[PDB]
Design a protein around this nucleic acid. Structure first.
Lengths: 133, 753, 755
RNA sequence: CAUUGGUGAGCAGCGAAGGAUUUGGUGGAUUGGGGGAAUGCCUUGUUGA
């Protein structure tokens, strides 16, 4: 909890409070669709409709299963979707804080656009476009 | 009287030489500076433009006074009691003599004249706003004392006025008019007097450098201060606890002297021009170690004591000599560059603050003959080229930093700089020497780029098109030079009958007018390379002329006091403005609103207003020495019965047609026999050669609503008589469609072909 | 050109929060917006003034009794004064703070300000000029209060002041120190906060309302005091009174709420006429007619930007939309009509040259990325990110087809042929451009030739060559109607987002990977490359357009201006948009060649080519007097009268010398005119044609002039194409108007023979 | 062999009775989900005073 804020170096505690509700939106939606008889094609199709969005959202990086919706959906999966967290992974940066300061004084170019927002969210598929200056 | 401009305002005025007034603004203070027939009210702590006189006086104001919230202005025989610049009251003194000094204490007004006669006024009620009633008249004969220097009032002196003279000091009981005290004859002539915050003591600064600490109760000296070779002009006392002395001099120097420790602290060296009187008034703040100095050099300065020598705090000033050459600094009509022959480089704001700032030369630079300014490259590099008198180089300047450039521009032909120019992109500078060479430099790097030599005399004006293609020039050997900017090729040249003194160029129309020695104005179309216009009528030389931004007018300023508007679609003079102070510079604003004129007398700049809300005027010289809304309204997606009976006997349907064409969509109206007379109105409406677009609507709505009433199931009744009167001119109206088929068909063909 | 280019109109009526007021005439509509000030009329909506001196986003505007004294109030709280035409005659710095209430005198003599916690009365001057440092002189002050004045009422006597404040008290002040009824009597006894106090014009009734929907009326009696007339206790509304206004008929009340409705009331009966709920978005401001016939109401920026006009008998007079920011524009094949693309997922129709919004189309699942027509006019098209791209009709209301067939959520760029036969679409993340048929919508072949994503798709008027810009430093040329494909050229620098083409198939401009703008031929020889973008408030090259005359290009980034260039190297102009906190995202030119387009968050559209500026086309002052020589040429020599008349550019001359000559002379003058005096008058005659009522007059002109040099203007196209457009729109618009009434008058006499 | 990096010395030219580099303060302009009962609560009925 507190150290998760410390490890991810989040600007605000309410930002953690946002994504728990955003996880809470998915989680009760994960509940109510699961509270159906197994013979329903409405049930079987629409679980897959929800999953196939969340792959390209980058929350489900690997290919996942039905029960992993209760499991793999965390706030930290959303916390990894932040811009400098993605920036540290592909190893053009050097530390966590180095990824911060380059967004601060503006050395990161995602595709054709200049971005200096620290709360920028990165998907699974748009990540090939981060360029230098 | 003028048919284009009206006198609008004057910017560039701070002081004139009159000693300033100071008054109370809540807890802070205000300062009243004089302009002439105008005054100005400023903040003490921040010096904001607060107030101004709303109406000019008949003559220049002699003495200024400031009561708690009131300003008292002294002129010919009248004193204006003003508040917030507004005339609340005006006294006229019962004399023809000129008012010199004023004094206000208790319930009194003291009005001194130049005939040694003073009028004393008293309030009716002590809670009144101002004295208004003539109480008494005192006269100072020559056996009583010298000429009155000032009028003062010390502490605890109720009903007693201190009238200092050239020879002695007088003390009056103004409730009675009695002179309760006379002093002895003084050896030195007194020029400056100042009240002390201690009791019964007045300071008496002499014509020489002597300060007379003079007791008023006993009538004696206790202390005098000897200053070698100074004329005392202003005196002020530090009233924050520290007992010190400031001595204004006529030289522009300010002598800081310590009273208790008996030491000369400092002297400000030439903070005002000795030629313009030096320090006219210097005044400490009450309880603050800040002194404000004024002079006759169109400026005011402020100085602080950091707890010690003084520190220069802030100042507001202008040109001390009337302006020579100016330029609009922006198209947003906010900033300007002004340069005068006092070797000063000022830059003015035009908004409600109307602030100013002198350009930084970081002992002055020599005075200026020409300017060159653009608005594309502020902050990126230098954007001002200045041509100085008797210099073989030009000086660059930055409007952003208000500071001088890094690049001086030598002519490289042993000649003085005579004409400067810039490119609209802000990249290249064009200078024309006194020998005839014109070099192109780069404003970013200060480098020699190109050099031309065709004129054998001094180059008087250089320009270039906004497309940076063709470069024009004019010289004193009659030569008009036409160059290509891309190449170095001589494109053309024209020789005139008179040498040319100035070149002003209109960029968005590619015209340039030229002031020649033959008193004519030669406006030139550059693309033709042809002299096209020439203007006549100016009896004397023109020094200033500029294009209207729409390219239609040129208002010129000549030595025969003629400021003439020249209309280009007629080629003639349409207006002449005859003044008493002739304008040295006329400058059209980038927007079509204002005019910048600098004059011979007066350090400020008169701005002139084109009315621009209307005109159709063309008067002359020398004087004193719909259509779819109704058809769209026809479809609906979701009285007059006098007039038809008047037209029943006659031809009276033009009025009914006027009521129908005026308002009232009449599908609802014509529903509430008579239709035969309606068809009569239709034939009379077809009789005119207009409004058939309404006639189509009327016939259409006639078919629509009442077509059953027209039908009547057994036709060829009397209805078909009026209809028979209709279809025969309907066939006359059937000609128009084939014309439209011609137009749309030919336009469709040329669309295909 | 050499014209002045600026906005005398704009895109979108109300985008930001503003007030609302009518005029005194009843035929004008004052519609403000948060940053600038624009004035409208009833019929033929045109933007009149443009007051922009604001750095903070609010505005207040009212006129005195005759519409010549006009102000605006921002949060900075200073005053600007224009007459009728945005002159800024007086720039009067009023305050550092804003004002809560402000009202003129009904006699136009005095002026009322409510700020801080006090009352400030200032002098109202007449119709005059500037020359004033302080044109406003204090008449009176009125002190004191307890806190800030929330609302204000005046008197017809202009000597009485009935006001209210936040302190729940209705204070009274005399204007000219008369001490009317010798008191400053505050009215109290209110259970909740007083929203509005209004004084009745009979000098008898005292209207008060509180925020609970309770209305209390008190009497003009000062036993001997003001007693009660009527009380209210409503506890069933569950809303808050947002805005309140009183009628000049002194019989009705009109109440606006926070709940997104508008309720109608009668004053002596205390009855509900009708309530009107249209949603949950609140009604911010409200304005009343000066006789009370029409009812309009303003709304919040976060709420609706949609203002609807009304009557006393409940029917809408005028409707309008204008939702969020503009992504692209598209010019109609006549150019008078303007469609909008926004983030909402709606496309809206706007004849904003006359202000009207006729209709809209709404089938989107997400936002729209581009809009573009077809030049036939039968069909326009939707370029959105909906997963399909659908086709549309003008006035027939039928989506033809939704073109799709692959799994795709992002359709970015698009191009069509001028014939309308095939439509190609560029997928963003998929490296394929897809052709689709006008027959059924068939995918014949798929074009996998890309390695970077596509950025622009542009097809030529030569109709043999497809041009494409992709995000892989490679410019792409293509042929479909032949038998093969063409080798695509290789760029030197610069992944390209923005591409521009000539409608001759020869000139092509590219935006580089910076502010350089380079142009070149079909033989890839670079003509110019334009320097980077300046203007700090980092580089942008987002949009570009080649002008229709073929002599200019317009460049747009997002650094809050726009740039102008010709076919040679140089800059024509640079027009900067002054605004406080990206700007530009679509640029194209008008087919009538009077302005061009600009898509922005704000919305601003026209560039105002003018004629008041003096030009010298053909050495004017060889023709010495512009009047007496013309009056000589109205008697004799009608050939030289028009050659002299074209060298002048005063329209008050052009109508008269163009009017004066007879009918028979017209084909003779059309026969003998030179060809260099031709394109500006053939350009002007189409825009000049739409206004006047002399249609047969100009008709006989354009038949002779049109018949005069048809082969030459066929030889000199790209200019007479535009002038041809400007006249042909007038041709078809009058044509379809008069043919219908011609037939509907034609069948009558044969029907008389029938029955 | 590379006026190759650093270090130091000297000369031409440029200026001549000083020059170059840094920093501080002051003044102005400008900017939450899933379950839950003994027990607390809510709501309704009920029991007598």
């Amino acid at each position: 909890d507190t150290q998760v804020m410390r490890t991810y170096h989040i600007q605000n505690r309410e930002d953690y409070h946002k994504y728990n509700r955003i996880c809470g939106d998915i989680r009760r939606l994960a509940n109510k669709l699961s509270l159906l008889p197994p013979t329903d094609p409405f049930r079987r199709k629409h679980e897959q409709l929800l999953l196939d969005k969340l792959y390209a959202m980058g929350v489900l990086t690997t290919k996942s299963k039905i029960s992993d919706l209760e499991n793999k959906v965390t706030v930290s999966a959303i916390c990894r979707r932040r811009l400098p967290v993605i920036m540290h992974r592909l190893k053009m940066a050097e530390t966590i804080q180095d990824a911060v300061k380059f967004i601060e004084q503006g050395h990161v170019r995602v595709g054709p656009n200049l971005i200096n927002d620290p709360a920028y969210l990165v998907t699974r598929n748009m990540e090939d476009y981060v360029t230098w200056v | 009287n003028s048919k284009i401009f009206s006198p609008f305002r004057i910017i560039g005025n701070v002081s004139n030489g009159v000693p300033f007034a100071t008054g109370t603004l809540g807890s802070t203070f205000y300062i009243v500076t004089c302009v002439g027939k105008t005054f100005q009210i400023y903040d003490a702590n921040t010096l904001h433009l607060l107030f101004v006189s709303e109406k000019e006086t008949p003559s220049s104001i002699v003495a200024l006074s400031a009561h708690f919230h009131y300003v008292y202005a002294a002129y010919e025989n009248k004193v204006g009691i003003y508040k917030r610049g507004i005339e609340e009251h005006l006294l006229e003194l019962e004399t023809d003599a000129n008012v010199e000094h004023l004094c206000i204490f208790g319930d009194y007004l003291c009005a001194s004249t130049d005939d040694n006669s003073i009028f004393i006024y008293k309030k009716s009620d002590p809670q009144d706003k101002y004295p208004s009633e003539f109480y008494t008249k005192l006269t100072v004969t020559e056996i009583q004392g010298g000429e009155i220097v000032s009028l003062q009032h010390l502490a605890t002196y109720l009903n007693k006025l201190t009238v200092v003279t050239k020879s002695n000091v007088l003390l009056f009981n103004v409730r009675t008019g009695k002179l309760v005290f006379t002093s002895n004859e003084f050896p030195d002539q007194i020029t400056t007097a100042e009240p002390a915050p201690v009791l019964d003591i007045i300071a008496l600064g002499t014509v020489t450098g002597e300060v007379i600490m003079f007791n008023m109760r006993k009538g004696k000296r206790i202390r005098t201060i000897k200053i070698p070779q100074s004329r005392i002009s202003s005196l002020s006392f530090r009233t924050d606890g520290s007992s010190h002395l400031s001595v204004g001099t006529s030289s522009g120097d300010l002598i800081f002297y310590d009273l208790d420790r008996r030491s000369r602290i400092h002297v400000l060296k030439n903070i005002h021009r000795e030629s313009y009187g030096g320090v006219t008034q210097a005044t400490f703040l009450n309880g603050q170690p800040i002194i404000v100095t004024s002079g006759g050099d169109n400026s005011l300065k402020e100085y602080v004591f950091d707890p010690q020598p003084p520190r220069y705090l802030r100042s507001r000033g202008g040109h001390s000599q009337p302006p020579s050459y100016i330029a609009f600094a922006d198209s947003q009509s906010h900033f300007m560059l002004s340069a005068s022959k006092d070797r000063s480089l000022w830059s003015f704001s035009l908004r409600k603050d109307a602030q100013s700032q002198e350009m930084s030369q970081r002992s002055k630079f020599p005075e200026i003959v020409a300017l060159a300014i653009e608005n594309a490259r502020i902050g990126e590099w230098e954007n001002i080229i200045t041509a100085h008198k008797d210099e073989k180089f030009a000086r660059t300047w930055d409007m952003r930093n208000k500071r001088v450039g890094r690049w001086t521009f030598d002519t490289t032909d042993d000649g003085f700089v005579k004409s400067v120019a810039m490119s609209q992109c802000g990249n290249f500078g064009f200078i024309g020497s006194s020998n005839g060479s014109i070099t192109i430099y780069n404003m970013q790097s200060g480098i020699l780029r190109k050099k031309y030599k065709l004129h054998k005399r001094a180059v008087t004006g250089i320009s270039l098109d906004g497309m940076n293609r063709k470069m024009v020039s004019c010289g004193l050997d009659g030569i008009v030079g036409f160059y290509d900017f891309n190449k170095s090729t001589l494109l053309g040249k024209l020789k005139l009958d008179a040498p040319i003194t100035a070149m002003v160029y209109h960029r968005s129309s590619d015209l340039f007018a030229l002031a020649l020695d033959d008193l004519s104005i030669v406006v030139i179309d550059a693309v033709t390379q042809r002299v096209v216009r020439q203007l006549w009528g100016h009896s004397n030389r023109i020094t200033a002329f500029d294009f209207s931004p729409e390219g239609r007018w040129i208002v010129s300023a000549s030595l025969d006091s003629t400021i003439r508007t020249w209309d280009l679609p007629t080629g003639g003079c349409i207006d002449g403005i005859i003044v008493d102070n002739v304008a040295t510079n006329v400058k059209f604003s980038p927007n079509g609103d204002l005019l910048a004129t600098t004059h011979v007398t007066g350090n400020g700049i008169c701005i002139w207003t084109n009315r621009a809300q209307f005109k159709t005027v063309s008067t002359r010289t020398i004087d004193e020495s719909q259509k779819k809304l109704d058809a769209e309204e026809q479809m609906n997606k979701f009285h007059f019965t006098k007039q038809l009976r008047e037209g029943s006997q006659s031809k009276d349907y033009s009025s009914l047609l006027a009521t129908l064409i005026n308002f009232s969509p009449a599908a609802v109206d014509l529903e509430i026999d008579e239709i035969v007379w309606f068809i009569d109105a239709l034939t009379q409406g077809l009789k005119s050669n207009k409004n058939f677009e309404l006639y189509e609507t009327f016939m259409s709505l006639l078919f629509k609503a009442h077509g059953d009433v027209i039908h009547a199931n057994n036709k060829n009744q009397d209805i078909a008589s009026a209809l028979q009167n209709w279809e025969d001119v309907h066939k006359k109206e059937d000609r128009l469609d084939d014309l439209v088929k011609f137009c749309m068909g030919v336009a469709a063909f040329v669309t295909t072909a | 050109m050499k014209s002045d280019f600026k906005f005398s109109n704009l895109l979108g009526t109300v985008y930001r929060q503003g007030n609302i007021t009518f005029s005194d005439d009843g035929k004008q509509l004052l519609s403000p917006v948060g940053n600038r000030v624009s004035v409208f009329d009833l019929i033929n909506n045109k933007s009149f003034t443009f007051e922009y001196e604001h750095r903070k986003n609010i505005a207040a505007i009212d006129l005195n009794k005759q519409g010549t004294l006009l102000i605006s109030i921002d949060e900075d709280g200073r005053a600007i004064l224009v007459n009728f035409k945005a002159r800024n005659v007086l720039h009067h710095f009023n305050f550092k703070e804003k004002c809560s209430a402000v009202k003129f005198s009904p006699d136009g003599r005095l002026f009322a300000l409510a700020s801080g916690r006090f009352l400030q009365i200032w002098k109202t001057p007449d119709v005059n000029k500037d020359r004033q440092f302080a044109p406003f002189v204090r008449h009176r002050v009125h002190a004191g209060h307890f806190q800030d004045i929330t609302s204000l009422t005046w008197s017809q006597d202009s000597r009485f002041i009935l006001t209210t404040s936040k302190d729940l008290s209705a204070k009274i002040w005399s204007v000219d120190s008369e001490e009317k009824n010798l008191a400053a009597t505050t009215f109290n006894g209110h259970r909740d906060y007083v929203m509005g106090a209004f004084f009745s014009h009979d000098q008898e009734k005292i209207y008060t309302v509180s925020k609970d929907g309770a209305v209390f009326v008190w009497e003009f009696t000062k036993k001997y005091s003001w007693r009660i007339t009527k009380k209210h206790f409503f506890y069933a509304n569950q809303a808050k009174v947002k805005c309140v206004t009183f009628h000049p008929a002194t019989r009705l009340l009109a109440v606006g709420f926070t709940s997104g409705e508008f309720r109608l009331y009668d004053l002596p009966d205390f009855t509900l006429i009708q309530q009107l709920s249209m949603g949950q978005n609140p009604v911010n401001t409200v304005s009343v007619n000066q006789t009370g016939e029409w009812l309009a109401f303003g709304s919040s920026k976060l709420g609706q930007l949609l203002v609807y006009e009304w009557q006393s008998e409940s029917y809408i007079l005028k409707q309008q939309g204008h939702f969020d920011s503009t992504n692209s524009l598209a010019y109609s094949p006549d150019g008078s009509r303007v469609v909008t693309a926004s983030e909402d997922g709606k496309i809206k129709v706007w004849d904003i040259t006359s202000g009207f919004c006729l209709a809209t189309f709404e089938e989107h699942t997400s936002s729209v990325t581009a809009v573009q027509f077809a030049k036939r006019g039968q069909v326009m098209f939707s370029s959105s990110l909906d997963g399909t791209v659908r086709a549309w009709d003008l006035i027939r209301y039928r989506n033809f087809r939704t073109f799709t067939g692959t799994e795709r959520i992002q359709f970015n760029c698009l191009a069509v042929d001028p014939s309308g036969e095939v439509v190609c679409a560029g997928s963003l993340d998929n490296f394929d451009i897809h052709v689709w048929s006008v027959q059924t919508g068939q995918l014949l072949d798929a074009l996998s030739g890309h390695e970077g994503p596509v950025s622009c798709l542009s097809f030529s008027q030569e109709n043999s060559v497809l041009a494409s810009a992709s995000w892989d430093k490679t410019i792409r040329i293509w042929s479909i109607f032949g038998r093969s494909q063409q080798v695509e050229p290789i760029e030197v620098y610069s992944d390209v987002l923005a591409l521009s083409m000539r409608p001759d198939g020869k000139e092509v401009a590219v935006s580089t990977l910076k502010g350089q703008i380079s142009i070149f031929n079909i033989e890839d020889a670079k003509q110019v490359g334009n320097i980077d973008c300046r203007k700090d408030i980092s580089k942008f090259f987002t949009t570009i357009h080649y002008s229709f005359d073929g002599m200019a290009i317009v460049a747009g980034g997002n650094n809050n201006s726009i740039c102008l260039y010709d076919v040679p190297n140089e800059v024509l102009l640079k027009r900067f948009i002054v605004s406080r906190n990206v700007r530009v995202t679509s640029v194209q030119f008008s087919p009538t060649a009077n302005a061009f387009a600009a898509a922005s968050t704000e919305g601003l559209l026209i560039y105002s080519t003018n004629d008041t500026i003096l030009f010298d086309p053909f050495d004017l002052d060889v023709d010495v007097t512009p009047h007496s020589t013309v009056e000589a040429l109205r008697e004799k020599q009608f050939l030289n009268a028009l050659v002299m008349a074209f060298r002048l550019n005063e329209e008050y001359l052009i109508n008269k010398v163009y009017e004066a000559i007879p009918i028979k002379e017209i084909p003779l003058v059309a026969s003998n005119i030179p060809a260099i005096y031709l394109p500006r008058i053939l350009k002007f005659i189409g825009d000049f044609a739409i206004e006047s009522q002399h249609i047969e007059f100009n008709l006989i002109w354009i038949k002779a002039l049109l018949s005069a040099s048809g082969g030459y203007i066929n030889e000199h196209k790209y200019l007479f194409s535009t002038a041809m457009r400007s006249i042909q729109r007038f041709i078809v618009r009058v044509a379809k108007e008069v043919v219908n009434t011609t037939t509907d008058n034609k069948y009558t006499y044969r029907f008389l023979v029938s029955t």
